[PDB]
Amino acid sequence: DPTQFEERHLKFLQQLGKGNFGSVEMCRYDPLQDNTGEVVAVKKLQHSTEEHLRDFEREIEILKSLQHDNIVKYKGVCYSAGRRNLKLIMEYLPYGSLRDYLQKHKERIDHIKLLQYTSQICKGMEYLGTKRYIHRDLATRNILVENENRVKIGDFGLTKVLPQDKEYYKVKESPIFWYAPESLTESKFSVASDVWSFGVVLYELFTYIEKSKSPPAEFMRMIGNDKQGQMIVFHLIELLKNNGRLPRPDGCPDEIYMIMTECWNNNVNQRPSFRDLALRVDQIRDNM
Ligand SMILES: Nc1nc(Nc2ccc(S(N)(=O)=O)cc2)nn1C(=O)c1c(F)cccc1F
């Protein structure tokens, strides 16, 4: 509906974040011009092209097709510049990314909270899988915090729909330290490579985003911090194929590390499902 969010009533409140190809703003949609209205987040392209606009349309369709408690809510589209451009309207989550939240609000984070967030992420990913969507960018920087009891998966800019006849999508066009080995070596993405990335997400959570413990910092320390360019990927592949893995974070229960290591299976079909993982995590919590 092109009259639902008219550019003239979308009022700027704050800049939230700019990347190479996207920017997000906090705005208030004020149809009565009474300095009220709903607070929303507005995503727009940066450095746009016809191909990026097309991908942006697919991203908007993906988000609109999702209705789940642990997925950022779609609100609509603004057809700005006299209906010659597109902006995506979605819900605004006050506490930002989970990565920043873990750094900033460690005073209210403990293992119980970490496993609650883990559970909610798994459920959101179960939901995504029923649409046969592959997120391809799961990371705590892309999970958002509504409040201390609720997180939601966001940033569907890399999300692909499986072909009807296949259980993987082959990208022909990269957060390499969250990638499964078969994504690095064959460009194959699947629910199982999303489960690999989720193991990296679980690792991040239990590192509490301490300095020098991020997956890039740890992998680079293992590979050699001097390495530059493609040699980095070469070494990353060789490491992963022969069982090199992120270490257990200090303070991390062996049981939780074992979840990480089972997600990090080189054998694509032996990784657990998101339903397995949700049940296992909620049973750990309920058994606690
Ligand atoms: N829908 C949404 N809500 C927010 N909340 C937010 C974002 C940033 C902050 S900040 N600058 O650290 O204080 C605080 C709250 N982000 N968000 C997004 O889609 C979003 C994203 F996915 C990636 C980058 C930026 C975004 F904006």
mmCIF file with all atom_site columns, N, CA, C and O and ligand atoms in Angstrom, residues 14-18 23-26 40-43 72-73 90-97 100 104 141-145 154-155, ligand 1:
data_model
loop_
_atom_site.group_PDB
_atom_site.id
_atom_site.type_symbol
_atom_site.label_atom_id
_atom_site.label_alt_id
_atom_site.label_comp_id
_atom_site.label_asym_id
_atom_site.label_entity_id
_atom_site.label_seq_id
_atom_site.pdbx_PDB_ins_code
_atom_site.Cartn_x
_atom_site.Cartn_y
_atom_site.Cartn_z
_atom_site.occupancy
_atom_site.B_iso_or_equiv
_atom_site.pdbx_formal_charge
_atom_site.auth_seq_id
_atom_site.auth_comp_id
_atom_site.auth_asym_id
_atom_site.auth_atom_id
_atom_site.pdbx_PDB_model_num
ATOM   1   N N   . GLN A 1 14  ? 16.506 10.096  14.604 1.00 0.00 ? 14  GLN A N   1
ATOM   2   C CA  . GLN A 1 14  ? 17.893 9.771   14.939 1.00 0.00 ? 14  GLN A CA  1
ATOM   3   C C   . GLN A 1 14  ? 18.487 8.891   13.830 1.00 0.00 ? 14  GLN A C   1
ATOM   4   O O   . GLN A 1 14  ? 17.771 8.116   13.180 1.00 0.00 ? 14  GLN A O   1
ATOM   5   N N   . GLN A 1 15  ? 19.787 9.044   13.585 1.00 0.00 ? 15  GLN A N   1
ATOM   6   C CA  . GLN A 1 15  ? 20.514 8.076   12.754 1.00 0.00 ? 15  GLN A CA  1
ATOM   7   C C   . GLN A 1 15  ? 20.916 6.883   13.602 1.00 0.00 ? 15  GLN A C   1
ATOM   8   O O   . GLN A 1 15  ? 21.458 7.057   14.689 1.00 0.00 ? 15  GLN A O   1
ATOM   9   N N   . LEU A 1 16  ? 20.690 5.675   13.094 1.00 0.00 ? 16  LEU A N   1
ATOM   10  C CA  . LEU A 1 16  ? 20.980 4.464   13.855 1.00 0.00 ? 16  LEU A CA  1
ATOM   11  C C   . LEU A 1 16  ? 22.225 3.734   13.371 1.00 0.00 ? 16  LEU A C   1
ATOM   12  O O   . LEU A 1 16  ? 22.841 3.005   14.142 1.00 0.00 ? 16  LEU A O   1
ATOM   13  N N   . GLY A 1 17  ? 22.636 3.928   12.132 1.00 0.00 ? 17  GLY A N   1
ATOM   14  C CA  . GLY A 1 17  ? 23.701 3.101   11.596 1.00 0.00 ? 17  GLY A CA  1
ATOM   15  C C   . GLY A 1 17  ? 23.717 3.185   10.088 1.00 0.00 ? 17  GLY A C   1
ATOM   16  O O   . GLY A 1 17  ? 22.656 3.151   9.449  1.00 0.00 ? 17  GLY A O   1
ATOM   17  N N   . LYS A 1 18  ? 24.912 3.359   9.529  1.00 0.00 ? 18  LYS A N   1
ATOM   18  C CA  . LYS A 1 18  ? 25.160 3.368   8.094  1.00 0.00 ? 18  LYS A CA  1
ATOM   19  C C   . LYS A 1 18  ? 26.207 2.308   7.785  1.00 0.00 ? 18  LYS A C   1
ATOM   20  O O   . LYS A 1 18  ? 27.187 2.157   8.524  1.00 0.00 ? 18  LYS A O   1
ATOM   21  N N   . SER A 1 23  ? 21.536 1.984   5.251  1.00 0.00 ? 23  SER A N   1
ATOM   22  C CA  . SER A 1 23  ? 21.520 2.952   6.338  1.00 0.00 ? 23  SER A CA  1
ATOM   23  C C   . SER A 1 23  ? 20.172 2.811   6.993  1.00 0.00 ? 23  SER A C   1
ATOM   24  O O   . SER A 1 23  ? 19.181 2.568   6.284  1.00 0.00 ? 23  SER A O   1
ATOM   25  N N   . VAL A 1 24  ? 20.121 2.973   8.326  1.00 0.00 ? 24  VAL A N   1
ATOM   26  C CA  . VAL A 1 24  ? 18.872 2.886   9.073  1.00 0.00 ? 24  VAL A CA  1
ATOM   27  C C   . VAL A 1 24  ? 18.702 4.135   9.942  1.00 0.00 ? 24  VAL A C   1
ATOM   28  O O   . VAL A 1 24  ? 19.647 4.592   10.608 1.00 0.00 ? 24  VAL A O   1
ATOM   29  N N   . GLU A 1 25  ? 17.474 4.631   9.986  1.00 0.00 ? 25  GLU A N   1
ATOM   30  C CA  . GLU A 1 25  ? 17.104 5.805   10.758 1.00 0.00 ? 25  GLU A CA  1
ATOM   31  C C   . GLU A 1 25  ? 15.923 5.478   11.647 1.00 0.00 ? 25  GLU A C   1
ATOM   32  O O   . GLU A 1 25  ? 15.020 4.739   11.242 1.00 0.00 ? 25  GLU A O   1
ATOM   33  N N   . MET A 1 26  ? 15.897 6.087   12.833 1.00 0.00 ? 26  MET A N   1
ATOM   34  C CA  . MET A 1 26  ? 14.711 6.117   13.677 1.00 0.00 ? 26  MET A CA  1
ATOM   35  C C   . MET A 1 26  ? 13.869 7.317   13.253 1.00 0.00 ? 26  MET A C   1
ATOM   36  O O   . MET A 1 26  ? 14.376 8.458   13.192 1.00 0.00 ? 26  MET A O   1
ATOM   37  N N   . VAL A 1 40  ? 9.318  4.157   14.338 1.00 0.00 ? 40  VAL A N   1
ATOM   38  C CA  . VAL A 1 40  ? 9.676  3.049   13.465 1.00 0.00 ? 40  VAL A CA  1
ATOM   39  C C   . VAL A 1 40  ? 11.134 3.160   13.055 1.00 0.00 ? 40  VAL A C   1
ATOM   40  O O   . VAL A 1 40  ? 11.759 4.218   13.164 1.00 0.00 ? 40  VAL A O   1
ATOM   41  N N   . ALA A 1 41  ? 11.662 2.064   12.520 1.00 0.00 ? 41  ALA A N   1
ATOM   42  C CA  . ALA A 1 41  ? 12.984 2.085   11.908 1.00 0.00 ? 41  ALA A CA  1
ATOM   43  C C   . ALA A 1 41  ? 12.843 2.063   10.393 1.00 0.00 ? 41  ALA A C   1
ATOM   44  O O   . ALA A 1 41  ? 11.994 1.336   9.854  1.00 0.00 ? 41  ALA A O   1
ATOM   45  N N   . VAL A 1 42  ? 13.670 2.854   9.703  1.00 0.00 ? 42  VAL A N   1
ATOM   46  C CA  . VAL A 1 42  ? 13.556 3.032   8.253  1.00 0.00 ? 42  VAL A CA  1
ATOM   47  C C   . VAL A 1 42  ? 14.883 2.683   7.622  1.00 0.00 ? 42  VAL A C   1
ATOM   48  O O   . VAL A 1 42  ? 15.884 3.344   7.891  1.00 0.00 ? 42  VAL A O   1
ATOM   49  N N   . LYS A 1 43  ? 14.890 1.672   6.776  1.00 0.00 ? 43  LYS A N   1
ATOM   50  C CA  . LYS A 1 43  ? 16.111 1.254   6.102  1.00 0.00 ? 43  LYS A CA  1
ATOM   51  C C   . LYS A 1 43  ? 16.096 1.774   4.677  1.00 0.00 ? 43  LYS A C   1
ATOM   52  O O   . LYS A 1 43  ? 15.084 1.671   3.978  1.00 0.00 ? 43  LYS A O   1
ATOM   53  N N   . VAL A 1 72  ? 12.292 -9.533  13.596 1.00 0.00 ? 72  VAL A N   1
ATOM   54  C CA  . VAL A 1 72  ? 11.906 -8.120  13.507 1.00 0.00 ? 72  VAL A CA  1
ATOM   55  C C   . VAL A 1 72  ? 10.619 -7.943  12.698 1.00 0.00 ? 72  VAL A C   1
ATOM   56  O O   . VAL A 1 72  ? 10.464 -8.517  11.617 1.00 0.00 ? 72  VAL A O   1
ATOM   57  N N   . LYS A 1 73  ? 9.682  -7.145  13.222 1.00 0.00 ? 73  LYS A N   1
ATOM   58  C CA  . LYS A 1 73  ? 8.401  -6.970  12.542 1.00 0.00 ? 73  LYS A CA  1
ATOM   59  C C   . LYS A 1 73  ? 8.483  -6.046  11.316 1.00 0.00 ? 73  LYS A C   1
ATOM   60  O O   . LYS A 1 73  ? 8.987  -4.924  11.391 1.00 0.00 ? 73  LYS A O   1
ATOM   61  N N   . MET A 1 90  ? 10.142 -0.781  9.370  1.00 0.00 ? 90  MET A N   1
ATOM   62  C CA  . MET A 1 90  ? 10.047 -1.938  10.251 1.00 0.00 ? 90  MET A CA  1
ATOM   63  C C   . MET A 1 90  ? 9.971  -1.465  11.693 1.00 0.00 ? 90  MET A C   1
ATOM   64  O O   . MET A 1 90  ? 10.068 -0.273  11.977 1.00 0.00 ? 90  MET A O   1
ATOM   65  N N   . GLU A 1 91  ? 9.816  -2.401  12.623 1.00 0.00 ? 91  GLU A N   1
ATOM   66  C CA  . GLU A 1 91  ? 9.765  -1.993  14.015 1.00 0.00 ? 91  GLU A CA  1
ATOM   67  C C   . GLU A 1 91  ? 11.145 -1.544  14.500 1.00 0.00 ? 91  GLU A C   1
ATOM   68  O O   . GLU A 1 91  ? 12.191 -1.999  14.022 1.00 0.00 ? 91  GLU A O   1
ATOM   69  N N   . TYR A 1 92  ? 11.128 -0.636  15.469 1.00 0.00 ? 92  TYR A N   1
ATOM   70  C CA  . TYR A 1 92  ? 12.339 -0.117  16.099 1.00 0.00 ? 92  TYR A CA  1
ATOM   71  C C   . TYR A 1 92  ? 12.605 -0.859  17.413 1.00 0.00 ? 92  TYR A C   1
ATOM   72  O O   . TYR A 1 92  ? 11.779 -0.833  18.322 1.00 0.00 ? 92  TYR A O   1
ATOM   73  N N   . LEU A 1 93  ? 13.764 -1.498  17.528 1.00 0.00 ? 93  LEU A N   1
ATOM   74  C CA  . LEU A 1 93  ? 14.093 -2.219  18.763 1.00 0.00 ? 93  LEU A CA  1
ATOM   75  C C   . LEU A 1 93  ? 15.037 -1.376  19.608 1.00 0.00 ? 93  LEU A C   1
ATOM   76  O O   . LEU A 1 93  ? 16.177 -1.107  19.185 1.00 0.00 ? 93  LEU A O   1
ATOM   77  N N   . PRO A 1 94  ? 14.628 -0.958  20.794 1.00 0.00 ? 94  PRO A N   1
ATOM   78  C CA  . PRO A 1 94  ? 15.380 0.103   21.487 1.00 0.00 ? 94  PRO A CA  1
ATOM   79  C C   . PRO A 1 94  ? 16.831 -0.237  21.831 1.00 0.00 ? 94  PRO A C   1
ATOM   80  O O   . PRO A 1 94  ? 17.653 0.687   21.849 1.00 0.00 ? 94  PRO A O   1
ATOM   81  N N   . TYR A 1 95  ? 17.190 -1.503  22.087 1.00 0.00 ? 95  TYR A N   1
ATOM   82  C CA  . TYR A 1 95  ? 18.502 -1.798  22.669 1.00 0.00 ? 95  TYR A CA  1
ATOM   83  C C   . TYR A 1 95  ? 19.515 -2.240  21.632 1.00 0.00 ? 95  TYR A C   1
ATOM   84  O O   . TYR A 1 95  ? 20.592 -2.711  21.998 1.00 0.00 ? 95  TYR A O   1
ATOM   85  N N   . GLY A 1 96  ? 19.172 -2.158  20.362 1.00 0.00 ? 96  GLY A N   1
ATOM   86  C CA  . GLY A 1 96  ? 20.159 -2.298  19.322 1.00 0.00 ? 96  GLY A CA  1
ATOM   87  C C   . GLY A 1 96  ? 20.575 -3.743  19.120 1.00 0.00 ? 96  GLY A C   1
ATOM   88  O O   . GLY A 1 96  ? 19.826 -4.693  19.423 1.00 0.00 ? 96  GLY A O   1
ATOM   89  N N   . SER A 1 97  ? 21.779 -3.919  18.581 1.00 0.00 ? 97  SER A N   1
ATOM   90  C CA  . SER A 1 97  ? 22.189 -5.284  18.281 1.00 0.00 ? 97  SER A CA  1
ATOM   91  C C   . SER A 1 97  ? 22.553 -6.013  19.557 1.00 0.00 ? 97  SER A C   1
ATOM   92  O O   . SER A 1 97  ? 23.002 -5.414  20.554 1.00 0.00 ? 97  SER A O   1
ATOM   93  N N   . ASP A 1 100 ? 26.157 -5.346  20.592 1.00 0.00 ? 100 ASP A N   1
ATOM   94  C CA  . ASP A 1 100 ? 26.397 -4.129  21.368 1.00 0.00 ? 100 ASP A CA  1
ATOM   95  C C   . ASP A 1 100 ? 25.798 -4.253  22.759 1.00 0.00 ? 100 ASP A C   1
ATOM   96  O O   . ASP A 1 100 ? 26.397 -3.804  23.745 1.00 0.00 ? 100 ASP A O   1
ATOM   97  N N   . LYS A 1 104 ? 27.507 -3.602  26.318 1.00 0.00 ? 104 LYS A N   1
ATOM   98  C CA  . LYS A 1 104 ? 27.068 -2.409  27.051 1.00 0.00 ? 104 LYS A CA  1
ATOM   99  C C   . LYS A 1 104 ? 26.362 -2.721  28.365 1.00 0.00 ? 104 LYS A C   1
ATOM   100 O O   . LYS A 1 104 ? 26.370 -1.889  29.282 1.00 0.00 ? 104 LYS A O   1
ATOM   101 N N   . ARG A 1 141 ? 25.763 -9.420  15.693 1.00 0.00 ? 141 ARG A N   1
ATOM   102 C CA  . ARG A 1 141 ? 25.537 -8.091  15.150 1.00 0.00 ? 141 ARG A CA  1
ATOM   103 C C   . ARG A 1 141 ? 24.205 -7.975  14.420 1.00 0.00 ? 141 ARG A C   1
ATOM   104 O O   . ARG A 1 141 ? 23.738 -6.860  14.205 1.00 0.00 ? 141 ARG A O   1
ATOM   105 N N   . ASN A 1 142 ? 23.592 -9.082  14.012 1.00 0.00 ? 142 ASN A N   1
ATOM   106 C CA  . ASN A 1 142 ? 22.346 -9.033  13.248 1.00 0.00 ? 142 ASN A CA  1
ATOM   107 C C   . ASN A 1 142 ? 21.151 -9.490  14.051 1.00 0.00 ? 142 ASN A C   1
ATOM   108 O O   . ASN A 1 142 ? 20.047 -9.592  13.496 1.00 0.00 ? 142 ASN A O   1
ATOM   109 N N   . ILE A 1 143 ? 21.345 -9.827  15.312 1.00 0.00 ? 143 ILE A N   1
ATOM   110 C CA  . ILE A 1 143 ? 20.233 -10.078 16.216 1.00 0.00 ? 143 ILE A CA  1
ATOM   111 C C   . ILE A 1 143 ? 20.010 -8.805  17.032 1.00 0.00 ? 143 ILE A C   1
ATOM   112 O O   . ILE A 1 143 ? 20.974 -8.130  17.430 1.00 0.00 ? 143 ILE A O   1
ATOM   113 N N   . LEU A 1 144 ? 18.755 -8.446  17.238 1.00 0.00 ? 144 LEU A N   1
ATOM   114 C CA  . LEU A 1 144 ? 18.392 -7.197  17.887 1.00 0.00 ? 144 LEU A CA  1
ATOM   115 C C   . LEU A 1 144 ? 17.675 -7.459  19.199 1.00 0.00 ? 144 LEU A C   1
ATOM   116 O O   . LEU A 1 144 ? 17.023 -8.494  19.385 1.00 0.00 ? 144 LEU A O   1
ATOM   117 N N   . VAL A 1 145 ? 17.776 -6.487  20.102 1.00 0.00 ? 145 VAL A N   1
ATOM   118 C CA  . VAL A 1 145 ? 17.300 -6.639  21.463 1.00 0.00 ? 145 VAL A CA  1
ATOM   119 C C   . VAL A 1 145 ? 16.104 -5.716  21.649 1.00 0.00 ? 145 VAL A C   1
ATOM   120 O O   . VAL A 1 145 ? 16.241 -4.488  21.556 1.00 0.00 ? 145 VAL A O   1
ATOM   121 N N   . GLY A 1 154 ? 17.225 -10.071 12.748 1.00 0.00 ? 154 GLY A N   1
ATOM   122 C CA  . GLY A 1 154 ? 17.041 -9.034  11.749 1.00 0.00 ? 154 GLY A CA  1
ATOM   123 C C   . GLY A 1 154 ? 18.006 -9.210  10.593 1.00 0.00 ? 154 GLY A C   1
ATOM   124 O O   . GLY A 1 154 ? 18.610 -10.289 10.418 1.00 0.00 ? 154 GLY A O   1
ATOM   125 N N   . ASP A 1 155 ? 18.144 -8.155  9.801  1.00 0.00 ? 155 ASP A N   1
ATOM   126 C CA  . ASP A 1 155 ? 18.998 -8.072  8.620  1.00 0.00 ? 155 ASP A CA  1
ATOM   127 C C   . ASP A 1 155 ? 18.871 -9.259  7.678  1.00 0.00 ? 155 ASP A C   1
ATOM   128 O O   . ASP A 1 155 ? 19.747 -10.141 7.630  1.00 0.00 ? 155 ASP A O   1
HETATM 129 N N1  . LIG B 2 .   ? 14.845 -2.412  13.329 1.00 0.00 ? 1   LIG B N1  1
HETATM 130 C C1  . LIG B 2 .   ? 15.994 -1.913  14.064 1.00 0.00 ? 1   LIG B C1  1
HETATM 131 N N2  . LIG B 2 .   ? 15.931 -1.400  15.303 1.00 0.00 ? 1   LIG B N2  1
HETATM 132 C C2  . LIG B 2 .   ? 17.170 -1.044  15.640 1.00 0.00 ? 1   LIG B C2  1
HETATM 133 N N3  . LIG B 2 .   ? 17.516 -0.523  16.909 1.00 0.00 ? 1   LIG B N3  1
HETATM 134 C C3  . LIG B 2 .   ? 18.752 0.155   17.170 1.00 0.00 ? 1   LIG B C3  1
HETATM 135 C C4  . LIG B 2 .   ? 19.740 0.263   16.203 1.00 0.00 ? 1   LIG B C4  1
HETATM 136 C C5  . LIG B 2 .   ? 20.900 0.936   16.510 1.00 0.00 ? 1   LIG B C5  1
HETATM 137 C C6  . LIG B 2 .   ? 21.029 1.462   17.772 1.00 0.00 ? 1   LIG B C6  1
HETATM 138 S S1  . LIG B 2 .   ? 22.541 2.350   18.205 1.00 0.00 ? 1   LIG B S1  1
HETATM 139 N N4  . LIG B 2 .   ? 22.894 3.435   16.949 1.00 0.00 ? 1   LIG B N4  1
HETATM 140 O O1  . LIG B 2 .   ? 23.547 1.383   18.557 1.00 0.00 ? 1   LIG B O1  1
HETATM 141 O O2  . LIG B 2 .   ? 22.274 3.049   19.471 1.00 0.00 ? 1   LIG B O2  1
HETATM 142 C C7  . LIG B 2 .   ? 20.054 1.351   18.730 1.00 0.00 ? 1   LIG B C7  1
HETATM 143 C C8  . LIG B 2 .   ? 18.880 0.695   18.423 1.00 0.00 ? 1   LIG B C8  1
HETATM 144 N N5  . LIG B 2 .   ? 17.998 -1.330  14.662 1.00 0.00 ? 1   LIG B N5  1
HETATM 145 N N6  . LIG B 2 .   ? 17.251 -1.850  13.677 1.00 0.00 ? 1   LIG B N6  1
HETATM 146 C C9  . LIG B 2 .   ? 17.815 -2.241  12.401 1.00 0.00 ? 1   LIG B C9  1
HETATM 147 O O3  . LIG B 2 .   ? 17.129 -2.731  11.566 1.00 0.00 ? 1   LIG B O3  1
HETATM 148 C C10 . LIG B 2 .   ? 19.309 -2.049  12.182 1.00 0.00 ? 1   LIG B C10 1
HETATM 149 C C11 . LIG B 2 .   ? 20.092 -3.086  11.771 1.00 0.00 ? 1   LIG B C11 1
HETATM 150 F F1  . LIG B 2 .   ? 19.508 -4.286  11.622 1.00 0.00 ? 1   LIG B F1  1
HETATM 151 C C12 . LIG B 2 .   ? 21.444 -2.928  11.558 1.00 0.00 ? 1   LIG B C12 1
HETATM 152 C C13 . LIG B 2 .   ? 22.015 -1.682  11.708 1.00 0.00 ? 1   LIG B C13 1
HETATM 153 C C14 . LIG B 2 .   ? 21.230 -0.609  12.103 1.00 0.00 ? 1   LIG B C14 1
HETATM 154 C C15 . LIG B 2 .   ? 19.876 -0.804  12.324 1.00 0.00 ? 1   LIG B C15 1
HETATM 155 F F2  . LIG B 2 .   ? 19.111 0.252   12.709 1.00 0.00 ? 1   LIG B F2  1
#
